[PDB]
């Protein structure tokens with residue numbers, strides 16, 4: 001028997017770690033040879049020396065249970081995972097944990113080695129350093145984070161953020177929250193260009209210092225900057241499984257699962273993390289909760305016992321998450337509950353990934 | 364000099380308590396002779412003996428600085444508060460804290476004495492007790508709370524909740540939260556009739572046990588119940604001030620204020636709580652924060668010093684609010700912050716109002 005995990009993200013490494021703890025045979029597959037703590041990728045593209053903390057070697061943790069490769073197909077009938085180098089991996093159980101993909105710096109999902117990936121982010125750090133004026137394209141989570149991280153490291157730089165909507169950040173967020181994102185950026189001094197769409201975006205020179213670049217919008221508006229960072233358009237990564245289940249995907253590319261996180265047509269394929277079509281926000285935190293359920297259900301499948309149900313609204317959230325302030329912001333109420341915001345821990349929980357991987361953080 | 368406060372709600376009693384602590388002369392005006400902890404009104408209409416904890420005598424706390432009356436006009440030029448009994452109260456500073464109004468049991472804003480108000484809720488408790496089947500009209504906060512409180516006290520009663528929208532609760536809440544409200548009610552066994560509008564609502568027999576009442580919807584749907592509770596339609600109470608500022612109100616009846624919570628046309632009128640037109644959710648918690656700012660600014664006005672600014676997103680929120688569980692539910696993220704839900708304390712913070720009023724809770 002063999003559990004194959006496609007995707008070594010937050011979900012995948014949680015599932016692999018747990019399968020190893022249970023001594024279930026498995027192979028974890030990822031394009032990269034290192035786990036990417038992608039939440040901290042924007043900080044890594046700004047703050048010198050930080051990128052080394054955001055990649056963690058898979059093989060050091062998992063040895064022969066890790067296999068680097070780019071999955072270009074899944075055959076659910078013969079139970080094969082098909083790689084871009086022609087090899088095929090049979091499975092008895094398949095966990096799809098393929099996450100979301102988008103432009104660098106926000107995402108870095110490609111076939112690359114750890115040192116080269118760290119050096120790609122370090123190169124970006126020097127380009128940022130060189131540039132007095134920087135445009136960020138995209139007002140979603142990655143763009144807001146990039147604007148904020150630049151102004152944190154370099155409070156005197158001129159940062160402009162352009163965004164096609166009326167308000168920043170994900171529509172599913174409370175507008176009270178969207179407006180607060182605007183106000184957080186304005187407090188840091190970022191200049192906002194909302195409802196404002198870059199024209200001929202494909203001709204931009206990105207991730208590079210270049211004096212006096214002129215960026216035009218569809219409104220004819222112009223700004224002159226020394227570097228352009230693309231933070232538009234993170235979408236669920238269906239590359240592994242599109243040819244097998246494309247006709248059955250949700251609109252956004254996510255996989256439809258039952259209450260046990262099994263794919264609807266199968267009892268031995270599961271989806272976790274962003275790529276599962278759940279009615280919950282796509283977070284690293286939930287990807288890990290999904291992994292617990294799926295590993296439990298693989299165990300129960302071996303033992304012919306009843307499967308566990310994924311309960312959204314897990315109560316396992318404590319002061320450990322967030323900071324130690326104990327402070328919050330009341331944002332609303334409803335039956336039995338209050339809505340609150342708390343500050344993220346400003347290490348962006350990097351240390352938890354090194355803990356999960358059983359590796360000391362770099363010196 | 365005299366600060367007149369119209370409305371002895373959460374905001375008004377906070378402002379009055381603080382003005383008394385500062386020894387600023389004031390008169391607090393409310394229709395009722397007792398403060399109503401309106402958050403717990405639905406529980407008070409269900410649980411025997413509980414209503415006595417939800418009304419607190421104004422005069423016991425404030426003596427001659429409280430005046431019962433129903434304000435039917437404000438004259439901002441002569442600086443008069445006009446009462447329905449013909450009397451007028453001059454002010455040097457006016458705080459409008461008029462809150463929101465709606466049907467009983469959710470709201471109880473009328474000229475009435477404390478013992479009669481408690482007895483009105485106790486009467487409702489016996490009508491609920493008598494009724495095996497109960498319809499709740501309205502899926503906003505009051506209706507959801509009424510359905511939940513009935514099924515908490517009487518898990519075997521048949522409770523139906525009818526609501527005109529597709530989903531329950533305030534649209535400004537996350538749909539993830541609206542759906543969770545649905546799931547909280549379904550777990551308690553409430554039968555939901557969504558997208559479903561009661562026909563001839565004015566002919567219903569409400570707040571009364573009556574066997575075999577037939578309720579028809581605009582869809583022709585019918586249900587047979589023994590009691591009907593109206594929880595539709597809490598709206599900002601502009602009765603005090605409509606004739607003075609109606610032309611300048613926001614659409615929902617709220618008052619437009621500047622960053623110091625002063626009414627736009629005046630330096631000596633302030634608005635706090637629900638009746639202030641702020642871009643924040645209307646809660647008792649915020650009404651009290653508004654009162655702090657306004658009292659500070661009245662002091663600063665006396666001393667000819669600069670006014671304080673109301674900063675939405677106050678950081679003064681701790682584990683004291685909520686329960687002691689320390690547990691939460693992660694609901695989302697954004698720059699620097701996580702969105703979380705925590706459980707309300709299940710006394711619905713009744714004890715804090717008695718503390719504010721300096722009165723021991725009833726035996």
Ligand SMILES: Cc1cc2nc3c(=O)[nH]c(=O)nc-3n(C[C@H](O)[C@H](O)[C@H](O)COP(=O)(O)OP(=O)(O)OC[C@H]3O[C@@H](n4cnc5c(N)ncnc54)[C@H](O)[C@@H]3O)c2cc1C
Pocket residue numbers: 006007008009010011012029030031032036038039042069070071072097098099100106108109110141142145234237239240241272273274275282283284285286287344696
């Ligand atoms: C700016 C920003 C901030 C965020 N902050 C937070 C936060 O504070 N908290 C939080 O909980 N979440 C946060 N998130 C969300 C978080 O990044 C994702 O929800 C999380 O990474 C999802 O984990 P996952 O396991 O589903 O996939 P990922 O972590 O995206 O990992 C997927 C992996 O699959 C691999 N893969 C995909 N397709 C293939 C293929 N065909 N072949 C081989 N390998 C493949 C990729 O190489 C990748 O390593 C943030 C996101 C952004 C953009």
Ligand SMILES: Cc1cc2nc3c(=O)[nH]c(=O)nc-3n(C[C@H](O)[C@H](O)[C@H](O)COP(=O)(O)OP(=O)(O)OC[C@H]3O[C@@H](n4cnc5c(N)ncnc54)[C@H](O)[C@@H]3O)c2cc1C
Pocket residue numbers: 333369370371372373374375392393394395399401402405432433434435460461462463469471472473504505508597600602603604635636637638645646647648649650707
């Ligand atoms: C079901 C439900 C649950 C809630 N739960 C919470 C919660 O958990 N936490 C939270 O923070 N908020 C909660 N709220 C919101 C909370 O009830 C209100 O935001 C709060 O009462 C606002 O306080 P206020 O001072 O603005 O006005 P109110 O508390 O409504 O007081 C206004 C007062 O003004 C008086 N008044 C009005 N007009 C006149 C007039 N013309 N003359 C004389 N007197 C007048 C009324 O008699 C009344 O006493 C809840 C609301 C509901 C409906």
